[PDB]
């Protein structure tokens, strides 16, 4: 019986894609590209790059997060 499906997973935010989206490295082996909501973008000023944050990755496309929690 498998399991695989989705997951939180810490990461960097180094990168900058289009239609509002970023490069989320996971060096530890893994590259993805996550987004960040907008409410929260027009709601706070966004950070420089590189963002230690939460990504959560999922099983129709790891290569495709979102970020959920961010640090220093």
């Given at each position: 019986?498998?399991?695989?499906?989705?997951?939180?997973?810490?990461?960097?935010?180094?990168?900058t894609l289009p239609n509002t989206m970023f490069?989320?490295?996971?060096?530890?082996?893994?590259?993805?590209?996550?987004?960040?909501?907008?409410?929260?973008?027009?709601?706070?000023?966004?950070?420089?790059?590189?963002?230690?944050?939460?990504?959560?990755?999922?099983?129709?496309?790891?290569?495709?997060?979102?970020?959920?929690?961010?640090?220093?």
């Amino acid at each position: 019986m498998s399991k695989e499906d989705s997951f939180e997973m810490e990461g960097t935010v180094v990168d900058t894609l289009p239609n509002t989206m970023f490069r989320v490295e996971l060096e530890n082996g893994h590259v993805v590209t996550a987004h960040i909501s907008g409410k929260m973008r027009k709601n706070y000023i966004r950070i420089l790059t590189g963002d230690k944050v939460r990504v959560e990755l999922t099983p129709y496309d790891l290569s495709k997060g979102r970020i959920t929690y961010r640090a220093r």
